Design a protein around this ligand. Structure first.
Ligand SMILES: O=C1Cc2cc(Nc3nc(Cl)ncc3Br)ccc2N1
Ligand SMILES: O=C1Cc2cc(Nc3nc(Cl)ncc3Br)ccc2N1
Ligand SMILES: [Cl-]
Ligand SMILES: [Cl-]
Lengths: 124, 4, 124, 4
């Protein structure tokens, strides 16, 4: 086509979605990770995770307001990944890399799994 | 704005 | 912080949100523009438009499944802007620039209004 | 991935 493109549009959209998340505006699901609860937008979770995409396209699960993750999932690893979904920034540290990679594999977040594998390979 |  | 950032994340999120829109997945509102209807995600509309942000943060309007726009709004101008919201690409043409600018002013989409004003100033 |  003969379209023009606004370079910063996608980043500005995501920044605004994160602002809605921070103020708990139009969040439509709670993700339960052991004793912790994380409120989010189903659409953002689906856009970032192969697991959430599969969950919310299921005709029964699409209507659930609460999703319980596998008990092996670490709440901090999930929190770091939820922040990444809404910001593009990943808080990857020596102390959390194993939990983050395990959570990203479960959530089916391929680019996160890839950088974790590379950071682990560099430290061996 | 750019030409994509 | 000491975060790393995935450059293409915001663009990939928006691409996926547009895929959900195309398949009518988790769309939660109909925007009525005269005889035409446009299905969308409230969160994406709020992230792109000062008007939708104001509408869906209102305690009564946040719960509406149908929003009727002012009858002066052109359905094609709205369609072009809805596509821009989900893609960052604006189909701006000599034949539609006036309707697009008028719709972007009503929707409170400042960057779109700015490029329309510049394209109009160049042709005078 | 980059250093932002
Ligand atoms: O690593 C990742 C990230 C991700 C996101 C989605 N999400 C969607 N995929 C498609 Cl094709 N359409 C709409 C949506 Br929402 C699917 C798989 C994966 N795997
Ligand atoms: O030209 C524009 C585009 C736009 C978008 C929003 N959306 C939001 N703004 C804020 Cl501050 N927080 C969350 C959201 Br969603 C508000 C105003 C405007 N004006
Ligand atoms: Cl990813
Ligand atoms: Cl804009």
């Amino acid at each position: 086509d003969s379209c023009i493109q606004f370079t910063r549009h996608a980043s500005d959209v995501l920044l605004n979605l994160n602002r809605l998340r921070s103020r708990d505006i139009l969040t439509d699901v709670v993700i339960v990770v052991s004793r912790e609860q994380f409120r989010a937008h189903k659409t953002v979770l689906m856009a970032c995770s192969g697991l959430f995409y599969s969950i919310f396209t299921d005709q029964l699960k699409c209507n659930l307001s609460v999703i319980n993750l596998d008990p092996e999932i670490n709440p901090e690893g999930f929190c770091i990944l939820l922040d990444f979904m809404y910001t593009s920034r990943l808080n990857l540290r020596e102390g959390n890399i194993m939990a983050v990679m395990a959570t990203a594999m479960y959530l089916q977040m391929e680019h996160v799994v890839d950088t974790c594998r590379k950071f682990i390979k560099a430290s061996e | 704005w750019v030409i994509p």
